[PDB]
TrEMBL record:
GO terms for biological process, alphabetical: sensory perception of smell
Any coiled-coil regions, as ranges: none
Annotated Gene Ontology cellular component terms: extracellular space
The species this protein was found in: Apis mellifera
Shown chain mapped onto the complete sequence: 29 to 144 of 144
Protein name: Pheromone-binding protein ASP1
Amino acid sequence: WVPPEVFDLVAEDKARCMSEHGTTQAQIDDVNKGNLVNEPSITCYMYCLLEAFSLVDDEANVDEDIMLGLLPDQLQERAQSVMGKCLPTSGSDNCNKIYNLAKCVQESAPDVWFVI
Ligand SMILES: CCCCNS(=O)(=O)c1ccccc1
Ligand code: NA
C-alpha cells in the first residue's frame, strides 16, 4: 500500500540501513511474503528504517500516532487494532523488539506489516 512518494524520500536511508546491517533485498522480499526469522541482518534493518522515519526511539518504543499517520486511511482501523494488541514492544535488544512486533502483527493482521 506504500505510495510512490515514500520510496524516493527513503532511498538514502534504505541504502544506509542495508549497508550497516548486511541486509539483502531477498530478505526484505521474504518479510513481505510473511517469512521472518530472528536474524539481525533483517531485524536490525527494520529497526534502522523505523528509526530513520522517527517511528521508534532509542529503545524501540513505537510512536503509534506517527506510525498511523503514514498508513492509508483504509488500513488505519485495522492497524490501530493490531497495535493495541502488539504494543508496547518488548525483547532482548532493539532489533529483537522489532522482530517480536513484526511477528505479532503478521500473525494478527497480515496486510499491515510491509517493509520498504
Ligand atoms: C507498519 C510497517 C512498519 C515497518 N515498515 S517500514 O519501516 O518500511 C514503513 C513502511 C511504511 C510506513 C512506515 C514505515
Ligand atoms: Na543475520
